Every structure is written in C-alpha cells, then in structure tokens.
C-alpha cells in the first residue's frame, strides 16, 4: 500500500479582486505542509479548518516551483519504465488548466521553451529530450489527447477528422485492466522543435469543441498522454527495454450530470473504504484510468483552490475531497 | 453621397478538401469584379449564376492583398477625420474572423507585426502608429470591443470585469443616430508595443465567453472600434484637430432567434426598397450601428464565401444578400 500523492495549489488574486482589496481566507504553510482556511468569525476572533497534504503551494508559487517539486520526480519514474498519472481537481476558475498547460506571457516576451507561465505538459515534453539527450538510451515519444464530454470520446490531436467525431472504446483482450480506443491518434514527437506546433493543433481543436459543445472547457475531462519507448544497449550488446507512460488529466470542474466525475468520486470512496466492488466500469473516465485508481500506476492529485471568501464552500469541498484521496493505496 | 461598397472574398480549400480532391464551384474574376457559381451539375456542361460586386477576391487572395486594396484606402479616410465601418458577413466557416482578425502562423515563426496571416484589426493598429508616429501628428488611440449575444451586450476588452457582466444602452440626447453604452471601456493604446497584450486580453475573454454562452463564436456579433484623436501640425505650422473612428464588425454567421441578425436584414431591405420606416430600433446591433447603415459613415461589407459544392445554397444566399446591399446610399 503506497499512498497516492496529494498536493494543494492556491491561485493568486486576479486584477478585479486586487482593486476590490480582497483578503485571502487561505494560508498555506509549505514547511508544515499545511493549508488553513478561515471559515467564519472576524479579525480578532475566528474559526479555521487546517489540512495536511504531501505538499502545499501558496498563491505566489511559480510554474517552475510546481514542476520541480512535483513533476520532476514523476518524470524520472516514467523514464525508469513506470506509468504515472497526474490529476488536476478543483472548481472551475482555480487553475487546473493553468497548472496542467499554462499560458503565454503577454506581448510575445518569451519563446515557448522559456516562458515562465508554461505548465506541466509543455515543460514535460521539453525535459524528456533534455534528460535523454546523450545517456545511451534510444527513445521515441508519442502523445495523444483523449477527451470526454457527456460520456462521449473525442480526439483533440487528429488532423484528418473533425473534433465532433466520437471515438469508440473497447476492452483490451490482451490487458484486462486496459482498453483500446478505436481512432485515437498517437503523434510522434521527433524532437523538442516539433512540440509547440503539435500543441497548437490541439489548441485549435479545443476552440472548435467549445463552439460545438456547451461549456466544453468546464464539463470535459482531458487526458494528455505521453508514452516513451526506451532501449538501452549494455556493454555486451544486449538490449534493454522499458516503456513509460504519463497521463496528465485535467478533470471537469468540481463545483456543485457528469457521469465520469460522479463515478470518479464513487471509485475513490470505494477504494478508501476498501469496499470489494469498485465501480470502474460505470464511466468512460474510470474505465480509461482504471490503473491510476488503486492499480499499478503511480498517481498524484493536484487539488486546486481559490483564495477568495466567495469560494469558501467549494474550497472546503475540494480540500475534503483531496484529503480523503490521500488514503488510496497504489502498487 | 457614396453607395456602400461590397466586396466578395472566397476562402481557399483546406487540407481535407484538398485530400478529397474537391473541385471549386466558384470562379472569381477580379478584373471584371465578378463571381461565377456553378449551380447545377457538370464541369463539361453547366448552368451558372454570376454576380458583379465592387470588388471580388478569389481563393488565392492573401491578407496583404486585402490590406492594400481595401483597408488602406479606408484607414486613410479615417485618418482624414471621417468615420468608416467594415462588416464581415457570411456563413460560419468561410473566413469572417480570419479576414477581420487573422491567425498566427504556426510554430512562433513570426512576430505579430509581421505575421502574413494577420487580419484587418492588427494590421490597422500597427499602421496607425507607423503612419502617425511618422509625420507631424500628435495623436491618441482608444479601442473598445463591444459584443452582442442573444441581445445582451458584453465588453470583451475590460481587463478588470468578467465578460458575464452585461452592459446597458440608452439613446444619446446630443447625437441623433447615436447611443450611449454605459460601462463600455475604451482602452488607450499608448504605442505599438501595447497593441498585442490588449488584443490578448480580448482573446482570453473570448474564451471565457465561449465557455459561458452556447456557440458564442458563431452566434455573437462583435464591434471592434478604433478612435483616433489627432492634432496635426503641418510643415507650415498650421494645427489641424481631427477625430477619426473605424468600426470593424464580425457579424454572427448567416447560415440557416438572432434578433440583431434578423433586424440587420430587414434594415437593409428597407434601405434598398426605400421604405420610409427603417427598423433600426428593433435590435441592439442596428441601434449601435445606425450611422453605418444609410447614415454619414463610409461603409463597406466583405462577404465571405466557400468554394465547396457542399456550401452551394449558403453561398448563393450570401451572394444574393450582399448584392442587394450594393444599393444602400450613405453620406
Ligand atoms: N497560479 C496562477 N497564477 C496566475 N494566474 C492563475 C494561476 N492559476 C490560475 N490562474 C488564473 O485564474 C484563471 C482561471 O485559471 P484556469 O486555469 O482557467 O482555471 P480552471 O482550469 O480550474 O478553470 C485564469 O485567468 C488564470 O490565468
Ligand atoms: N482566406 C483564407 N485563407 C486561408 N484559410 C482561411 C481563409 N478563410 C478562412 N480560412 C480557414 O477556414 C476556417 C474557418 O475560418 P473562420 O475565420 O473561423 O471563419 P468564420 O469566422 O466565418 O467562421 C479556418 O480554419 C480558417 O483558417
Ligand atoms: C498558449 C496556447 N496553448 C499553449 C500552445 C495551449 O493551448 C496549450 C499548451 N501550452 C503550452 O504548451 C504553453 C504555454 C506556455 C508556454 S508553452 S499545453 C496544451 C495546450 C492546448 C491543448 C494541448 C495541451
Ligand atoms: C491569435 C490570438 N489573437 C490574436 C491576439 C486574437 O485573438 C486577436 C487578433 N489577432 C491578431 O491580433 C493577430 C493575428 C495574427 C497576427 S496578429 S485581433 C483580435 C483578437 C482577439 C480579440 C480582439 C480582436
Ligand atoms: Mg480549465
Ligand atoms: Mg468567426
């Protein structure tokens, strides 16, 4: 029983909250690894709720800090031939996409590789090539972007098909924890200099999905997968194989219709309560990610939260959800 | 007085259409200012419908060609201190947004100033500074982005309000075919190096509008306005004060609920048939743009069309609509 890693990241105030002089109800203490939320009362007398997690990232945490602390170790595990999954979980508006993908610094200040606002996906793709540049491990990188909306499956990277084209899912006869998704494009990323244009094609498909499907960016779940096939050659000419897969999952907004979100919650509850039956098959998302929930994949959850008093109830909901998830045991 | 000038722009075939060896049902003859549509069957015998416009631009037409032939003369009129409007009209998918805004060339190949895929808005803003930072002109540039969705008004540039906040409109007691939009932000663009980040904020707010409102990019109407206040002192020391405004309007898609689109059509019909009553007040769009529709503003329409046989009926509908509009007299 190796526990799932669960971390918390609080977003900073936006311009509007700044000009309204907003006070944070969230204090994160990184060294105590604690998040403390003011739940009522006043200045000189108050109620709070405090939570301990594996790591906590306050409103001022930069993208590089998150990448170095959480992702760098996981990418090392992937390169060793393990499968790893990182979920982002929290209410719409708290920074799941910011964390997982990032944004461009304004006014074309930086190239993509150096942009301090880059998130997990671009940083990860850049660093694989760097880590494996001349260590004797030959490798290939392939990426896919499978998304779930109203329990239908979409491919956000395939250049032939329109986004509206549903994919079909089947059990894998060879892997009984596994599925096969008919139609899903795997794009080979040949070098660092192919990364950005591949991601641009996905961003373009994201805009069309939003035009076509109501609140697509909030209600959809996205699974960005990167698979690294590796071959080492020993001094005696024998070849050594490993395959590492990283799933980077940007969940639908948690705020309180979404069968996959509901089933994820039920799967987590089943696993933490150690009920024998765990309802993976009750949604697409949980069938796809079966191995990341009490399976042989190394899993982390980045729980995203708001500093704003406006968001107190959903913030507490997120923390309680993430804090319960700590008790999931993966092998 | 000045009839509205109407130009046609046919988009080129895309990747998929080229893959499927599509043959164009449109032939554009710019010297003759004509577009010819194959309306029945064959490439060896065929019925055709033809239309003559103020200008016609075929599939080969690039953004720079549109800029030099259409935008330059209009911007020169704006800089002389006059008001001008350019509408884009046509079915979703035919290049309204491409024409008015443009896109980025992939893989960070260009800066925004030099990107060949830049449309009217960025080219205009760049050129205002280029032209006037030259001569003996003291000038200020303000922009606003007012958008209409389901007869509600949104400000898509305001960096410190969320898009969801609707604006109110009222008649302007001083200006007769004029309105006041309470809360609409005019952003000062101090120099060329402030242009892109202002547009990026708009891009960002566009994304949130699409999440919040169904089919936003297709059903919304957007009015991007640029106002230039100029104090020109001539070589001879004379000081001329002028005010120029340019409205760049990206209309909701015309394809077969949208009160402003319906009212625009009915307004054009009344103007062409010279019905004494012209129904401006029946929608927000036509009240906001009343001076551009049989008023004192110099107005042009760019009708966008498809070369694909799939789109024949909508293409014909667009051409007929646009061709009617030629008869509208402005002052
Ligand atoms: N760590 C952060 N630093 C700066 N801005 C952030 C951060 N996290 C989120 N944001 C901002 O908050 C808003 C919501 O972030 P987003 O990634 O869209 O949230 P979600 O995907 O959870 O809805 C965006 O405007 C984004 O720029
Ligand atoms: N003149 C053009 N040249 C190249 N591509 C174009 C042109 N016009 C439209 N397109 C392409 O067609 C698709 C739809 O264009 P878009 O601007 O979104 O149309 P609309 O705004 O009318 O829906 C886009 O992929 C765009 O790049
Ligand atoms: C900023 C526009 N971009 C970034 C290309 C994105 O859309 C994007 C990503 N962003 C990035 O790659 C970066 C942001 C800042 C520097 S790189 S990751 C990703 C997308 C869209 C779909 C696939 C996952
Ligand atoms: C490419 C992302 N961008 C371009 C910033 C756009 O959104 C954009 C425009 N595009 C541009 O400014 C360019 C395209 C290519 C070179 S510059 S004009 C405009 C927008 C969004 C809202 C206001 C009107
Ligand atoms: Mg998001
Ligand atoms: Mg458009």
UniProtKB/Swiss-Prot annotation, chains A, B:
N6-acetyllysine: modified positions: 131
Binding site for ATP: 90-97
Oligomeric and partner information: Interacts with the thyroid hormone receptor in the presence of thyroid hormone. Component of a large chromatin remodeling complex, at least composed of MYSM1, PCAF, RBM10 and KIF11/TRIP5. Interacts (via C-terminus) with the kinase NEK6 in both interphase and mitosis. Interacts with RARRES1 and AGBL2. Interacts with TPX2.
Residues of the full protein shown: 16 to 362 of 1056
Listed transmembrane segments: none
Source lineage: Eukaryota, Metazoa, Chordata, Craniata, Vertebrata
Function: Motor protein required for establishing a bipolar spindle and thus contributing to chromosome congression during mitosis. Required in non-mitotic cells for transport of secretory proteins from the Golgi complex to the cell surface.
Residue intervals of the Kinesin motor domain: 3-328
Modifications after synthesis and translation: A subset of this protein primarily localized at the spindle pole is phosphorylated by NEK6 during mitosis; phosphorylation is required for mitotic function.
Family: Belongs to the TRAFAC class myosin-kinesin ATPase superfamily. Kinesin family. BimC subfamily.
Disulfide pairings: none
Organism encoding this protein: Homo sapiens
Localization per record: Cytoplasm; Cytoplasm, Cytoskeleton, Spindle pole
Superkingdom as given in the UniProt entry: Eukaryota
Full protein name: Kinesin-like protein KIF11
